Structure formats: structure tokens, C-alpha cells
Amino acid sequence: KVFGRCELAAAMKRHGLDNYRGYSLGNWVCAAKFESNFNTQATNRNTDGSTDYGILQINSRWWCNDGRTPGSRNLCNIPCSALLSSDITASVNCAKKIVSDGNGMNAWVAWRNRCKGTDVQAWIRGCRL
Numbered sequence: 001k002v003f004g005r006c007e008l009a010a011a012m013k014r015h016g017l018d019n020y021r022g023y024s025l026g027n028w029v030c031a032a033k034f035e036s037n038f039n040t041q042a043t044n045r046n047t048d049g050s051t052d053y054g055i056l057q058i059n060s061r062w063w064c065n066d067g068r069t070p071g072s073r074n075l076c077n078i079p080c081s082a083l084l085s086s087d088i089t090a091s092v093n094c095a096k097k098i099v100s101d102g103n104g105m106n107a108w109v110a111w112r113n114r115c116k117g118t119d120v121q122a123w124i125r126g127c128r129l
């Protein structure tokens, strides 16, 4: 599913992302835009053999099981395919675990390079929230 910007904002807000660990809604929408272009079905393979999955591009090295990342962990306790669903619940739940792990949203490379220190509120502007 390819989300609308406001549609996703509303979805994330409902799932308890707004201000989660201090990160305003705009940060999550920004991260999603640049990680996956709001596409739940986005996948990207990394040099190390791991794969990133879904709207927030969560990585199979630590967070989910895809059966093909030797010596990886499954800290979210889910198959990586569950991160590709039209229902963002699994991705949200897992992102909450990642952002609580000490490094905040810095775990998302696109957030750090393209959202951090920017006017992220702009990503939810005009939305009925």
C-alpha cells in the first residue's frame, strides 16, 4: 500500500507514535517518506546480506526474521514479511522498540541525514489530525 502523507500521519498518531520518546509526529512521517516513499512494500538489500523492510525500512540483522540473514537476531519477534503489510501495526510496534534502544531515531539513516534538524512539523501541516 502506498500511503498519502496525511493518511499515514493519522495512522501513526492512532498507533501512539506522536511524541513517542519525545519525537513529534512530523519526525516519523519524514522518516517514512525518505526511507520508503510511504510504500509498505519497500525492500532494500544491504552489503552485509541483511534486508530492510517496509514503510520504516526495519533491518533483518537485528529486528525481524527473514530466514536469510545468518547469525541475525529477531528482537521484534516477527517475520520480516509482516512489516510489508498494508496494516502498519507491526512496523509501528517494532519501531517503538528500536527508538527506545538508546540511539533514538538516529537508527534511521534517512531521518538523521534528511529530517533531523529540519522543520519536521511541515510533514503534518494541513492534515486533519
Ligand SMILES: [Cl-]
Pocket (backbone or CB within 6 Å): 021, 022, 103, 104, 105
Ligand atoms: Cl532520543
Ligand code: NA
Pocket (backbone or CB within 6 Å): 060, 061, 062, 063, 064, 065, 066, 069, 072, 073, 074
Ligand atoms: Na534477523
